[PDB]
């Protein structure tokens, strides 16, 4: 079975389909987008599965989920309410890759502290598509950000259908 990276958005401004087109660009109803992960260790044909609402997740989608990438709106204090509503499904699927994505954190809403607390509690990593700051010039081993970081994280996974090199 071809694994899925389940992608959804809890924001009304930015959709899972938009996020998936950003991922594919790197070097309601469910939609599947084929994507071949290719690196020095393996290649793996997966699907980026855009699921606009959780009630469209069928048994057969669920059993294929090996990554979960959820976009959220950080502008309000309530921004993680809708994300946390996915957690019963995420703890059922037990994906090895779990990524919480926003455009950037908001000090007036979900700030970095609150997003980090939630990610560490639940086994996610926080990614910003448009970090306000560029990384420090003396951060000699910097972390990738944005969609590049999402792609790195999806590469750092032993997909069930890896073809090893």
């Amino acid at each position: 079975g071809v694994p899925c990276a389940l992608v959804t958005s809890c924001s009304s401004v930015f959709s899972g389909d938009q996020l998936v087109q950003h991922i594919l660009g790197t070097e309601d109803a469910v939609r599947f987008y084929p994507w071949t992960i290719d690196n020095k260790y393996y290649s793996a044909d997966i699907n980026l599965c855009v699921v606009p609402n959780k009630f469209l997740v069928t048994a057969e989608i669920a059993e294929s989920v090996q990554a979960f990438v959820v976009y959220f709106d950080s502008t309000q204090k309530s921004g993680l309410d809708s994300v946390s509503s996915w957690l019963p499904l995420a703890k059922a699927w037990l994906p090895e890759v779990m990524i919480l994505v926003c455009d950037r954190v908001s000090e007036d809403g979900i700030n970095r502290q609150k997003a980090q607390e939630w990610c560490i509690k639940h086994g996610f990593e926080l990614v910003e598509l448009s970090p306000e700051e560029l990384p420090e010039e003396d951060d000699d081993f910097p972390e990738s950000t944005g969609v590049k970081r999402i792609v790195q994280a999806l590469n750092a996974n032993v997909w069930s259908n890896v073809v090893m090199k």
């Binding site: 779990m98 560490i120 990593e125 081993f141 910097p142 972390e143 790195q152 994280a153 750092a156």
Partner: protein, 121 residues
């Protein structure tokens, strides 16, 4: 001396561990789960280490990986930070970068490099 060395990700995934104390696997897992939570939750770099039980957890983030070396409270955390950095340089020399991907798919080489650089803790 060094009690153990951990390499883990921002998602809390333990990718490499080297122990210099004999403990059953479930005990080691209790320890590493707790330590990973503590280190990931530190948002401000106000020390090279976290005091934990009787140990000093000397740690540093390199790219998306945390490197943690647990030493005794009286031990030299400055030399430990240097040791961690020198291990990272050895990894960077072999793999051409510092990536979780390398630790996942070339675990034995990362472990070999560490084990042959560190003698007994």
């Amino acid at each position: 001396m060094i009690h153990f060395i951990l390499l883990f990700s921002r998602q809390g995934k333990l990718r490499l561990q080297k122990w210099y104390i004999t403990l059953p696997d479930k005990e080691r897992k209790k320890i590493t789960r707790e330590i990973v939570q503590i280190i990931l939750s530190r948002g401000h770099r106000t020390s090279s280490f976290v005091d934990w039980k009787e140990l000093k957890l000397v740690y540093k983030r390199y790219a998306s990986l945390y490197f943690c070396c647990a030493i005794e409270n009286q031990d030299n955390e400055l030399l430990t930070l240097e040791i961690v950095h020198r291990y990272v340089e050895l990894l960077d020399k072999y793999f051409g970068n510092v990536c979780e991907l390398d630790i996942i798919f070339n675990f034995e080489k990362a472990y070999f490099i560490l084990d042959e650089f560190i003698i007994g803790g």
